[PDB]
Amino acid sequence: MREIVHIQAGQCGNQIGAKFWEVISDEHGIDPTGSYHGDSDLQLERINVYYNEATGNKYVPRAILVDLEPGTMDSVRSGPFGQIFRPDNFVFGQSGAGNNWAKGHYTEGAELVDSVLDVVRKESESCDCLQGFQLTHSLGGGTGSGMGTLLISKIREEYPDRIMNTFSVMPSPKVSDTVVEPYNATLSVHQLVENTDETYCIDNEALYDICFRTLKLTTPTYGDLNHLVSATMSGVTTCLRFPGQLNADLRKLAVNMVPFPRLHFFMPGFAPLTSRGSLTVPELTQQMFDSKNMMAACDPRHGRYLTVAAIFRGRMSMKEVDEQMLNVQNKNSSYFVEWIPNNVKTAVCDIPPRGLKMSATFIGNSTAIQELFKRISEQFTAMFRRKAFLHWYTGEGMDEMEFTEAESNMNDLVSEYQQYQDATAD
Amino acid sequence: MRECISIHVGQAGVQIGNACWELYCLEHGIQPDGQMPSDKTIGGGDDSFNTFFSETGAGKHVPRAVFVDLEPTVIDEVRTGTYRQLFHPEQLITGKEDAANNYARGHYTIGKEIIDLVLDRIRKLADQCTGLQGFLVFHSFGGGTGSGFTSLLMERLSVDYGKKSKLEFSIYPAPQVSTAVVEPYNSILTTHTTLEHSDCAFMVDNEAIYDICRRNLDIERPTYTNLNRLISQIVSSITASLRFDGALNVDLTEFQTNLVPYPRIHFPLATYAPVISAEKAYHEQLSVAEITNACFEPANQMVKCDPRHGKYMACCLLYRGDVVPKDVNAAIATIKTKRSIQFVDWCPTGFKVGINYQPPTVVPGGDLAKVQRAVCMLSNTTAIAEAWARLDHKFDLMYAKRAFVHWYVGEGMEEGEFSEAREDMAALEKDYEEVG
Amino acid sequence: DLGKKLLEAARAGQDDEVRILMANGADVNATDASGLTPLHLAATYGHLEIVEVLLKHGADVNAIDIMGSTPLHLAALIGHLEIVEVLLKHGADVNAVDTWGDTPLHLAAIMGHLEIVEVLLKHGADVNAQDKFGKTAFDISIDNGNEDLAEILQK
Numbered sequence A: 001m002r003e004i005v006h007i008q009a010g011q012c013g014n015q016i017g018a019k020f021w022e023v024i025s026d027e028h029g030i031d032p033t034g035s036y037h038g039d040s041d042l043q044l045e046r047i048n049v050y051y052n053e054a055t056g057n058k059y060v061p062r063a064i065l066v067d068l069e070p071g072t073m074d075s076v077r078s079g080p081f082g083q084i085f086r087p088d089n090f091v092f093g094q095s096g097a098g099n100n101w102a103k104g105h106y107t108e109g110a111e112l113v114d115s116v117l118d119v120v121r122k123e124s125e126s127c128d129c130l131q132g133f134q135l136t137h138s139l140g141g142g143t144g145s146g147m148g149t150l151l152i153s154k155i156r157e158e159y160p161d162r163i164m165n166t167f168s169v170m171p172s173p174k175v176s177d178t179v180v181e182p183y184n185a186t187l188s189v190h191q192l193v194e195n196t197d198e199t200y201c202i203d204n205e206a207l208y209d210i211c212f213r214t215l216k217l218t219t220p221t222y223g224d225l226n227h228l229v230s231a232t233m234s235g236v237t238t239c240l241r242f243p244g245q246l247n248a249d250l251r252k253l254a255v256n257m258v259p260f261p262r263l264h265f266f267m268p269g270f271a272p273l274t275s276r277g278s279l280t281v282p283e284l285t286q287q288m289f290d291s292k293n294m295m296a297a298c299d300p301r302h303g304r305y306l307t308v309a310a311i312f313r314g315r316m317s318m319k320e321v322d323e324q325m326l327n328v329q330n331k332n333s334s335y336f337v338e339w340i341p342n343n344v345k346t347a348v349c350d351i352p353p354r355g356l357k358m359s360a361t362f363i364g365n366s367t368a369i370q371e372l373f374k375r376i377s378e379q380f381t382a383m384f385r386r387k388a389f390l391h392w393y394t395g396e397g398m399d400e401m402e403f404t405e406a407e408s409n410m411n412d413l414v415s416e417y418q419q420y421q422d423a424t425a426d
Numbered sequence B: 001m002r003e004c005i006s007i008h009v010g011q012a013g014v015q016i017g018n019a020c021w022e023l024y025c026l027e028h029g030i031q032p033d034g035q036m037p038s039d040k041t042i043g044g045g046d047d048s049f050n051t052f053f054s055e056t057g058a059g060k061h062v063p064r065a066v067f068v069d070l071e072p073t074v075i076d077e078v079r080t081g082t083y084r085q086l087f088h089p090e091q092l093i094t095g096k097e098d099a100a101n102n103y104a105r106g107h108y109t110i111g112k113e114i115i116d117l118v119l120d121r122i123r124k125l126a127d128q129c130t131g132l133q134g135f136l137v138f139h140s141f142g143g144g145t146g147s148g149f150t151s152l153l154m155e156r157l158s159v160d161y162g163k164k165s166k167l168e169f170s171i172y173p174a175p176q177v178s179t180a181v182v183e184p185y186n187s188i189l190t191t192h193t194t195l196e197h198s199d200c201a202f203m204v205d206n207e208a209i210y211d212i213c214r215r216n217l218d219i220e221r222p223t224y225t226n227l228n229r230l231i232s233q234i235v236s237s238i239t240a241s242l243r244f245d246g247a248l249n250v251d252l253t254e255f256q257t258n259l260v261p262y263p264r265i266h267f268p269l270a271t272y273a274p275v276i277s278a279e280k281a282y283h284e285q286l287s288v289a290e291i292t293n294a295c296f297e298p299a300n301q302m303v304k305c306d307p308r309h310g311k312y313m314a315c316c317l318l319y320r321g322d323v324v325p326k327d328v329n330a331a332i333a334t335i336k337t338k339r340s341i342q343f344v345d346w347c348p349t350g351f352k353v354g355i356n357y358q359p360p361t362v363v364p365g366g367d368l369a370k371v372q373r374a375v376c377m378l379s380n381t382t383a384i385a386e387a388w389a390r391l392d393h394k395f396d397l398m399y400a401k402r403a404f405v406h407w408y409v410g411e412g413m414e415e416g417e418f419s420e421a422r423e424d425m426a427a428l429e430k431d432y433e434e435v436g
Numbered sequence C: 001d002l003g004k005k006l007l008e009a010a011r012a013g014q015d016d017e018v019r020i021l022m023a024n025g026a027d028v029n030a031t032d033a034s035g036l037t038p039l040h041l042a043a044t045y046g047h048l049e050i051v052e053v054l055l056k057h058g059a060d061v062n063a064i065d066i067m068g069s070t071p072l073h074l075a076a077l078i079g080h081l082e083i084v085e086v087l088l089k090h091g092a093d094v095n096a097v098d099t100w101g102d103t104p105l106h107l108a109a110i111m112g113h114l115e116i117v118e119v120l121l122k123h124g125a126d127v128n129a130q131d132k133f134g135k136t137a138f139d140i141s142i143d144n145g146n147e148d149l150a151e152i153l154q155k
Ligand SMILES: Nc1nc2c(ncn2[C@@H]2O[C@H](COP(=O)(O)OP(=O)(O)OP(=O)(O)O)[C@@H](O)[C@H]2O)c(=O)[nH]1
Pocket: A009, A010, A011, A012, A013, A015, A016, A068, A069, A096, A097, A098, A099, A100, A138, A139, A140, A141, A142, A143, A144, A145, A169, A170, A171, A172, A175, A176, A181, A204, A207, A222, A225, A226, A229
């Protein structure tokens, strides 16, 4: 269990994906040219999980970059770490998908799907022991959502025994008021429930709410929202990238975090919350469990934690962390299911992220996530009831029964969360 | 002289293995390269240490041991540490992908890719034996490899070595230092499938060891390094009768005769005393009477349970050091005038005694102080049923909801195996209730 | 039949075609299979100029399709602010109720068009109007944790 093949699809997928490579390269001592300028030998111990070793001892990201729109490729290369990507790993079509899930999944997206798979095969065969895959995408557009899910199902057919993990960005009218986004997101959730082992739910609603109400940015931009996303992605991948006592991988996280196959949607959290260009263990435990620090717009105190994983990064007493973790489970006991004993796991990493002396990353599988699913469901139903813009989908080959089926699956998912929230250990 | 082969499975079995063979080398006077200057018979011999160590024509004393793990990180440390030259390079076997804390991967899917290589390498060790008595198997209950691979291995050893004894040293999970939520599942699955293939099993409760490291050794937050050093001292006291001259538990068969009245209730409790911090170099020396009494205090037990709540079916007292036999007799006589020692009416109320007159060895860099006398008590008490009930209750909370079961079913295991394994544990709890 | 052509011209945003068809006798109030009129389609697809042209030529601002949707319900749902204002200026029933018990306020609230919500509130939209499941627009903002919307509805 070593290498991860990362794939980034569509505009949101590529933008969040580029920021991830930039941030984790800085933590690992890697520069935009691909050279290692680090001071700690702990920065190269698990470098092969995300990087390929190349001639001259150069470190090339095991990343594949895909979009139906060509202009995206130019914005990736013009960034700070733009030239670090493999020039052959860019698969870019000619015509975008114009926020149409059907375009991404059935027509324009399906033409460019065998090309992406050729690149996936090449990176996968060059791996000593492939762990699985990591996909970054939005659910609101057409390429990341429609083509992204198609890519997932295709990869799932070729590599069934490997883990499929996604960083999936949920829509919010607060960031993008494009009324077809609940359609796109609902269609994609229907695919994610079946075809991924673990999904990090990154909600644009929560990201906007943090920037506006907590960070005091009255006009938040993509840069501002992506600053919270990059810190979350850095935190949740800490244990895949740094040795530690645990030898953590994607499958060990799946076995321990996911008790029922469909309930694999995680609510990530981060502390401290900070803005661009601008703490003790007890405070960091508190903040990490506060609804205002969650990356999904759900109150954890409205539901129950099935499983939790928390990563404290920086120099601190492990006994103090153990003490505070047990303390948070005592006073907040009614928010944890009592039928899954010892369901809170903690790791401590010596290497902290950039700009912070201490940090804590929270990964929760909470029944409160049904709030996020219900919000999108209510919007999908308001649109679907009036059959607004339905022809834009059915004209691409889609059947109106796929909408009915997607809505039916997502409501069944909400009922399943409610079921375990009301379950008792008797 | 009858040989004993030790098999260490998964991370816990391997790390505990490393700390035991280090200690064995120190007790017998074997150097890290395998040289032993106190051994006059070069290239062979029939001495007691020969039960655990074979000899080459060059005077090298090699452990009769196999280390197996489904991933290579833990065994690679053995390949590069202080005792790298001591083991047979082919004796250290590693796969590429571990069992991901899943009994089914260790037993059915990943485990089958290496089972024949392991068995063929064990046969090479067995072929070099004049009169193999059996195997000592070290493994965790909680890991995917320690649970599933160990079961598959125990099944195959029962077919290929039918007449040979099998003894386990098993690590029982603790919430304080565990890895997975599904450890109760792995623990019940491996117990059910190994029960008929094991003759005697010594469980080591990680919570008991953690508590002793904190209370007696003043170690704030014990690591696996501190736990394994204490565990290896206790495993050394249990195996000393196999590697040195003596009159008690001299062979694997005798551990069954002395400690196992009935085949299924083969889980003896070990108690060890005294455990003193190395920072107290000038401690007062405890008498034979004080250390003997210490054996009946729940705090010094390897498995958390209350023997006052149960009945004894056997009791063996293994002393090491400056111990006069009449002082043992006097301490036992005083201990007999006590209402908390109740034997089952069908067993003699006797205490078997074995004394090795060499003091225990401590490893350089360890946490324990040197002592002039130590005792390890091995007893079969129905109070160990408390350990089984705590694990069964954790299993039941999850299983009622079928939480995590799909991970097992997706690795070639039927859901019916979980209920058959739980039914066997219900029967095992009733076996202890029937004895008393 | 110029009515079927006018329906298609209003959806596609063909301004000159609407003017031609009406001059030749096209039914400004023609309906499709589901009861949608050229004004419903113009309001849905955001053709502001076609909406104003149709209203100056006898289109019923309060026409309902088979599901009880008025052009104002569709304009509030899709988020077309200029069209919502034109429809109210021309007499649209701010509190019209469709077959699901929704008013344009319920649809502007669900879809998060907060500016349209303020406009509907200023023109008399009823905060106590309940849908078929008894929810008002204020209940929708409480149930979804939309603090921005709850603040606006509490004005
Ligand atoms: N957080 C965040 N959201 C983004 C970003 N870029 C786009 N989005 C969101 O993603 C959704 C739109 O999807 P895109 O990724 O732009 O679309 P696409 O996958 O490229 O598909 P098409 O262009 O329609 O073919 C909307 O909800 C946007 O708010 C970004 O960098 N950060």
